[PDB]
Enzyme design. Structure first.
Site, PDB file in Angstrom:
ATOM      1  N   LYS A 277     -39.695  -8.415   4.179  1.00 13.14           N
ATOM      2  CA  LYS A 277     -40.625  -9.509   3.876  1.00 13.14           C
ATOM      3  C   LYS A 277     -42.061  -9.045   4.066  1.00 13.14           C
ATOM      4  CE  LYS A 277     -38.776 -14.169   4.158  1.00 13.14           C
ATOM      5  NZ  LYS A 277     -39.313 -14.131   2.761  1.00 13.14           N
TER       6      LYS A 277
ATOM      7  N   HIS B 214      -7.491  10.075   3.237  1.00  9.67           N
ATOM      8  CA  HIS B 214      -8.556   9.234   3.785  1.00  9.67           C
ATOM      9  C   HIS B 214      -8.153   7.795   4.099  1.00  9.67           C
ATOM     10  CE1 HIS B 214     -11.373  12.448   3.598  1.00  9.67           C
ATOM     11  NE2 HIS B 214     -12.428  11.660   3.734  1.00  9.67           N
TER      12      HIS B 214
ATOM     13  N   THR C 209     -11.491   4.912   9.981  1.00  7.58           N
ATOM     14  CA  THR C 209     -10.538   6.009  10.129  1.00  7.58           C
ATOM     15  C   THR C 209     -10.117   6.136  11.586  1.00  7.58           C
ATOM     16  OG1 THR C 209     -10.933   7.374   8.181  1.00  7.58           O
ATOM     17  CG2 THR C 209     -10.516   8.495  10.230  1.00  7.58           C
TER      18      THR C 209
HETATM   19  B1  LIG Z   1     -10.899   3.691   6.234  1.00  6.61           B
HETATM   20  C1  LIG Z   1      -9.633   2.761   6.150  1.00  6.61           C
HETATM   21  C2  LIG Z   1      -8.831   2.617   7.265  1.00  6.61           C
HETATM   22  C3  LIG Z   1      -7.723   1.792   7.171  1.00  6.61           C
HETATM   23  C4  LIG Z   1      -7.362   1.094   6.025  1.00  6.61           C
HETATM   24  C5  LIG Z   1      -6.086   0.212   6.079  1.00  6.61           C
HETATM   25  O1  LIG Z   1      -4.940   1.016   6.193  1.00  6.61           O
HETATM   26  C6  LIG Z   1      -5.843  -0.798   4.953  1.00  6.61           C
HETATM   27  C7  LIG Z   1      -4.607  -1.651   5.268  1.00  6.61           C
HETATM   28  C8  LIG Z   1      -4.207  -2.699   4.217  1.00  6.61           C
HETATM   29  C9  LIG Z   1      -5.144  -3.528   3.605  1.00  6.61           C
HETATM   30  C10 LIG Z   1      -4.742  -4.472   2.661  1.00  6.61           C
HETATM   31  C11 LIG Z   1      -3.394  -4.598   2.329  1.00  6.61           C
HETATM   32  O2  LIG Z   1      -2.934  -5.526   1.384  1.00  6.61           O
HETATM   33  C12 LIG Z   1      -2.460  -3.786   2.935  1.00  6.61           C
HETATM   34  C13 LIG Z   1      -0.997  -3.964   2.552  1.00  6.61           C
HETATM   35  O3  LIG Z   1      -0.639  -3.942   1.345  1.00  6.61           O
HETATM   36  O4  LIG Z   1      -0.150  -4.147   3.455  1.00  6.61           O
HETATM   37  C14 LIG Z   1      -2.862  -2.846   3.879  1.00  6.61           C
HETATM   38  C15 LIG Z   1      -8.178   1.251   4.910  1.00  6.61           C
HETATM   39  C16 LIG Z   1      -9.307   2.077   4.973  1.00  6.61           C
END
Ligand SMILES: Bc1ccc([C@H](O)CCc2ccc(O)c(C(=O)O)c2)cc1
EC number: 1.13.12.7
Length: 539
Positions: free
Chosen positions: A439, A241, A339
């Site tokens: 409200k 996911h 996604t």
């Molecule tokens: B549903 C959904 C779709 C995509 C994502 C992303 O892939 C997250 C990407 C991310 C976020 C924060 C970080 O620190 C890092 C990283 O460590 O590089 C990477 C999450 C949920």
């Protein structure tokens, strides 16, 4: 003024040529040749696997699959929970150009069917504990020719492991270090088929280009994390996911040690954070609120912990500050992603944290807000629908161009369905169902408070509270309700019940409209319109 249209900066790493498989292979081959470089660590059984191990076996699975007959016109399923073996068939398949649909370990048997009917896979990789569920599902899907067991070395129930499968098809003199991965068009060739809102999960097709962009983010000192030797990550988030999938791929590009945990446990968690010298931890949203209640964090040496990330899950500002306070971090790194957009396209950048924001636009992308009625793009500090355009957008929903379209306008914008605004400094902010207030009289009840009441009733299967706009009262609070399968109920019988558990301003004066389903909004969060929309007619 294409100037209220917000733009991600320049990449630190330019986009690199080649397919997703060609750059993974190239990066991992670099680290394979340094003995002892750790790729994955199983926090449960304490076992390490090196890139040399990880590179070699992936390559063999690629050439063993090539020989079996799989080209880019086939797909495989990887069905298993987070494990040392997970990305072996994934990496192997991308090297080939086979499209990978990760399936959900403990998707029940019905959701295993819906996933795999869309992905129509020739070969299925599965964990010992997933086997019978896919056997059962094979006798309902003729396309599933071959089943390979991931967490064995010998055969298992006569079925074959990746290991005996590979020695059963690799040619006599095969050489892991002379293998070359296929070149193919990274725009048309699907790398991943992901799952997902309302109805049944669709198959989000994502081509090799989206991972290639992701690989530029992962290294970005501002939007990813810096390639420092001995970086390690503790990842709890599922390897499917979203989030779990594309951080791990980017982590293999960087040479990091990915420490995985498949079952969550407070002490195990915190001790691995400490002992593995974890630089950054990955968490699912309701593991944030859990850690807000944790009182043991103070007993562990997290001297080494730089970042806690929530991914594409936007966070309650109260929960985020709580988590960051218990860990003594300036902030959380939250982002917003669908996604249908692979990774996050809004990410909080390094240092520049701003209270309550998800972040700013990732490089290669554009994000904008649009007025929900005229469709015209709005300016600074105005709330509209959030729209994004960039290389990591989904190619489409498999077998569903009717949904692919109208989610993506053919100027290449995905329409999120979620509402947002942005700052004079370009930070973005996400508006949730959960603090839009009704409200009546002039004091307001959270719709979540009224939903909690409605879901408490044995015959109410799901509810959705929004504010019926009426001219005299301001807002009468109303609900869409879904009844449990057996049961039958009446609008007044429902409001009589609420009006017996709430102040009197909080009463369900708006009434109830029975729906087959409460509208969700792509990230699963209740859609505040449609619901309001639904009640406006029925009145
Ligand atoms: B549903 C959904 C779709 C995509 C994502 C992303 O892939 C997250 C990407 C991310 C976020 C924060 C970080 O620190 C890092 C990283 O460590 O590089 C990477 C999450 C949920």
């Amino acid at each position: 003024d294409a100037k209220n249209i917000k733009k991600g900066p320049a990449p630190f790493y330019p986009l690199e040529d080649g397919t997703a498989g060609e750059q993974l292979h190239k990066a991992m081959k670099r680290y394979a040749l340094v003995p002892g470089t750790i790729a994955f660590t199983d926090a449960h059984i304490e076992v390490n696997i090196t890139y040399a191990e990880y590179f070699e076996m992936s390559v063999r699975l690629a050439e063993a699959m090539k020989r079996y007959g799989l080209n880019t016109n086939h797909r495989i399923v990887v069905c298993s929970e987070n494990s040392l073996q997970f990305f072996m068939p994934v990496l192997g398949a991308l090297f080939i150009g086979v499209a990978v649909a990760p399936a959900n370990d403990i998707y029940n048997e019905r959701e295993l069917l819906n996933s795999m009917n869309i992905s129509q896979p020739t070969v299925v990789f599965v964990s010992k504990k997933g086997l019978q569920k896919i056997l059962n599902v094979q006798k309902k899907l003729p396309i599933i020719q071959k089943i390979i067991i991931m967490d064995s070395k010998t055969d298992y129930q006569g079925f074959q492991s990746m290991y005996t499968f590979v020695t059963s098809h690799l040619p006599p003199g095969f050489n892991e270090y002379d293998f070359v991965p296929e070149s193919f068009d990274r725009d048309k060739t699907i790398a991943l088929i992901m799952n997902s809102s309302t109805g049944l999960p669709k198959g989000v097709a994502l081509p090799h280009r989206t991972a290639c962009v992701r690989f530029s983010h992962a290294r970005d000192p501002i939007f990813g994390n810096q390639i420092i030797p001995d970086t390690a990550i503790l990842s709890v988030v599922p390897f499917h996911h979203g989030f779990g999938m594309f951080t791990t791929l980017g982590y293999l590009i960087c040479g990091f040690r990915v420490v995985l945990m498949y079952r969550f446990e407070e002490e195990l968690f915190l001790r691995s954070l400490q002992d593995y010298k974890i630089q950054s931890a990955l968490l699912v949203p309701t593991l944030f609120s859990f850690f807000a209640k944790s009182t043991l964090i103070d007993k562990y040496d997290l001297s080494n912990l730089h970042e806690i990330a929530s991914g594409g899950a936007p966070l309650s500002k109260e929960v985020g500050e709580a988590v960051a306070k218990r860990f003594h971090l300036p902030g959380i790194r939250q982002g917003y992603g669908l996604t249908e957009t692979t990774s996050a396209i809004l990410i909080t950048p390094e240092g520049d944290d701003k209270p309550g924001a998800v972040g700013k636009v990732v490089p290669f992308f554009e994000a904008k807000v649009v007025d929900l009625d005229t469709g015209k793009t709005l300016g600074v500090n105005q709330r509209g629908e959030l729209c994004v355009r960039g290389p990591m957008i989904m190619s489409g929903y498999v077998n569903n161009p009717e949904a692919t379209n109208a989610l993506i306008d053919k100027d290449g914008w995905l329409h999120s369905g979620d509402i947002a605004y942005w700052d004079e400094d370009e930070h973005f902010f996400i508006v949730d169902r959960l603090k839009s207030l009704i409200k009546y009289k002039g004091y307001q009840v959270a719709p979540a408070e009224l939903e909690s009441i409605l879901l408490q009733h044995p015959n109410i299967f799901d509810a959705g509270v929004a504010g019926l706009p009426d001219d005299d009262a301001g807002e009468l609070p109303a609900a869409v309700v879904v009844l449990e399968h057996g049961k039958t109920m009446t609008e007044k019988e429902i409001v009589d019940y609420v009006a017996s558990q709430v102040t009197t301003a909080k009463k369900l004066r708006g009434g109830v409209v029975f729906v087959d389903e409460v509208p969700k909004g792509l990230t699963g969060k209740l859609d505040a319109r449609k619901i309001r929309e639904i009640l406006i007619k029925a009145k």
